[PDB]
Amino acid sequence: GSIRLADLAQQLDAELHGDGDIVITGVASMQSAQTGHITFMVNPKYREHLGLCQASAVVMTQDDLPFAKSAALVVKNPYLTYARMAQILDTTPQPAQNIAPSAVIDATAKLGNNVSIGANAVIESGVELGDNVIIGAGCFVGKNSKIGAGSRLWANVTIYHEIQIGQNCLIQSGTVVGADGFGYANDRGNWVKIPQIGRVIIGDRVEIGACTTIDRGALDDTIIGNGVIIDNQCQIAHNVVIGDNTAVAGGVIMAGSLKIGRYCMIGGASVINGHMEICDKVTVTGMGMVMRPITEPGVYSSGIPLQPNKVWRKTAALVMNIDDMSKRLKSLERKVN
Amino acid sequence: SIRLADLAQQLDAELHGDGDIVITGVASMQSAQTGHITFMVNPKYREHLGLCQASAVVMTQDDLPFAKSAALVVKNPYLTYARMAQILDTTPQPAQNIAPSAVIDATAKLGNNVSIGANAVIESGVELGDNVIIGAGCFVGKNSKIGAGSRLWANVTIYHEIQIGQNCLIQSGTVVGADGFGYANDRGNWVKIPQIGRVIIGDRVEIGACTTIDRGALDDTIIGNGVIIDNQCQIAHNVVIGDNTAVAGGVIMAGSLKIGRYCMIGGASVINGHMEICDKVTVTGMGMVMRPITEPGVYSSGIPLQPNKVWRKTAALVMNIDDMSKRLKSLERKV
Amino acid sequence: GSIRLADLAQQLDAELHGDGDIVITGVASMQSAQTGHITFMVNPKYREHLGLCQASAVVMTQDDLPFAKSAALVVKNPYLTYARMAQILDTTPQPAQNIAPSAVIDATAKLGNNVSIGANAVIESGVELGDNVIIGAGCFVGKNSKIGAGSRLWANVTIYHEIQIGQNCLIQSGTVVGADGFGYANDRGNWVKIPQIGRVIIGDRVEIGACTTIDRGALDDTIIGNGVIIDNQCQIAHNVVIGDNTAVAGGVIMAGSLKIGRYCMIGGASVINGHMEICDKVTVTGMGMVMRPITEPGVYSSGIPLQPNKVWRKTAALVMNIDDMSKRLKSLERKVNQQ
Ligand SMILES: CC1(C)CC(=O)c2c(nc3nn(-c4ccccc4)c(O)c3c2-c2cccs2)C1
């Protein structure tokens, strides 16, 4: 939806330098922007490049202003302003509008005001959908689950029974919330299923990527705190607890009964052992092999990275034989001493 | 609800306390309230059984002196817990009866008491055995066969010509029978090899959510009886998994791997193909399996986490370990 | 489906030795093949085994021919001929045929000729489906997305809005194309979503496995080149660009803004970090941990493989303490150097 530059500047708390009557139609990258677009500059190395940008307006700082070759919106934080203006001008559609005649909705489900449910979605008995909730096409929402006001599911999301989802969450397609945890007892080599009768509780303002799986708890619950952001294809096992505002990047695999504190950052493709705790304010870099508890805040890493194959063959063989190398070092130390 | 004495009989457990107590459900020790049965495995909880508010606790004989409530005495509290949770299970079924919005080919062959959820799609020639339950939004492709008692949660995809045994359970988002990753090369251009084998899943197999099991190229991908597979796993074409093996979350297996019986594959392991793992092998988490495993036991890989400042030095030195080796050999020659 | 052996041989450009009137019904492995089946031999150790194979015909080389115990098709490349004959005799069904009454299709969607849309599929406003496109049961195709002629989606594929897919592509079930990239700003310790208003552009002849995710770009686009093959459970982040003919095996994760060249081969379970480039003709072996750009073609690897647990415990402890081993070696060198 188009907006006058002066009105956009007011909504952004930006200082306008230039024509307030310019009409802005959307956001674009600096290299792709054309007339009607607003863009932003975060890297001052691009000052000398601004004459190449065809945007109608550029968000920048006060120090950048002398280098502008366009209307400019001056702010302290161009990146955050970009995020805000991209929300004002967002072109992303809603997953559904109104209630599709092909949706299958149990007579006992409770729908708030202004709820939309897409084609062929399936809502079980006892479900409660808060005001402004949007359920995409093809979703399934299981018995007695509750989805708080303003939350949105994209197409083909699966929510099992007895799940609680807070307000203003966003779940991408293919995600499964509330499948059975991996709970089995062993009887003489045969696995005996343990029914998983806990739940999943997801807080407010949680964003979950695509094809992520969050299993329900065995007895007590799997819990995702407020403001958590989880990328695609993560596995959050039964009885995991993830503290408020933690970020989990793509493809992280967590085992059961892991507790992660608040304010953590878990890098993509990490692997985290279960039945243990990671304290608040921990960053694990990508592909981290988290075998043991983390008890102090800070940054932690693992992994021996890529080498040319010919070199790697020697590295791996020598590491595998490092005990012999250690024994030889000690023997030579003794001989020299 | 069930009387404690009746529950104790079904569990073959020895009752110490009031058999007339009514048990309504299972709970953890910390959450248990009047009416709940709970269990303990670790002796550390003995000291505060007096804070547990369950109506009964499953425990061992050595635990009995510490009991502060009715107690069921058994040899294996964890297994008894599994059985009592089955007796008291509150989990609903994926569907009941056949939904009017399900789309079912007239040539599907349906047993007795089959339930099919809303908007599920059943192709021609599919056979569903007695008591099979197909969740909402599933797809079951042409000529696939699902044995008696098996159940699919919502939004499961089964391709064509797949065979699934009796009493299996498949969680949502899983895909069984997609094409294996098979391509010839005609001068830099990939040429698709149609994948015309199948997947054969035995009896009592449980598969997690968003797991993929690909069909074979000519012969079949095979999942043995009693296998349990967690979420986010990839089982490539022509993999064979032996009975009772367990595969934890996020494991990736390459084509034509054969895994034996009673194996335990830890989470996020990577198992290469065209090789065999014998029976009774455990691979720990993130294991990098490059070679056949011919003896039972526990196997591991990986250099675990360190503080970043320490890791930087560890990785740099490991990357230069050939130079360290050459320097050591030079020093030996000199000495 | 069935075809006379002489006709199959002509279509494969193979030399027939045997009865061209044999009727071939399908392809099978050597171990499983029965009357009516054609099979192939690539490994000459099986020459002595050919009398146990009950196929009606076997594809083989001229050097294998004296060992035959069946009608034979002689070719230079049995494996490639196998791929071609399996295509000729393919038993794989189509994801759908015709337009299902239970599909929900916006009035503004545009269909080419001979499109098939499966049961309970959902097609949004503005979608364009090319000639011969097949959309499987239960799929979702979001607003304004375009799928080129001959492309096929299996059941339960999700395509978001503003996605472009070329011709003759194949996408397996459970895959999600165009979900939001993992983009957030920081407002005084609160995450602020960055709308992901770029797209995904997929070229021609791309095959994508099952439960793979390919996120849309933040402003500009995620791009998959022509002829790319991507296995199951892969994660392609926002703004990744993959060059023509690259192959990505199962379970690979690629972080945002990675650029991969043409003719690359990325082994299963690799982890490729972002904001960097991999040049053409690079092979990364399985489980590779890619932290830096790759500027020269060739083969690259990482990872310390499995050992018995008791051995691994000692290996890991010694590696974690390798700085002390390095210091000890340096001290010993100074002593041997008389310093
Ligand atoms: C949340 C944010 C706005 C900032 C952030 O913290 C983050 C972001 N995207 C990431 N992608 N990958 C990734 C993905 C796949 C493979 C390898 C790496 C990370 O590790 C990512 C991280 C993190 C780095 C270290 C801890 S979390 C976006």
Ligand SMILES: CC1(C)CC(=O)c2c(nc3nn(-c4ccccc4)c(O)c3c2-c2cccs2)C1
């Ligand atoms: C594309 C092709 C026809 C040939 C090919 O190169 C390839 C293929 N299938 C693979 N499966 N896995 C795999 C899968 C899961 C776990 C571990 C390994 C690889 O790594 C594979 C590779 C590659 C090897 C090195 C770089 S790509 C089939």
Ligand SMILES: Cc1ccc2c(c1)-c1c(cnn1CC(=O)Nc1ccc3c(c1)OCCO3)CO2
């Ligand atoms: C996730 C993680 C991360 C880092 C790790 C470990 C685990 C780990 C290491 C050594 N032991 N463990 C625990 C482990 O792998 N247990 C295990 C093994 C096989 C199984 C299983 C559990 O669940 C049932 C299926 O088979 C090395 O670092």
Ligand SMILES: [Mg+2]
């Ligand atoms: Mg319908």
Ligand SMILES: [Mg+2]
């Ligand atoms: Mg992985």
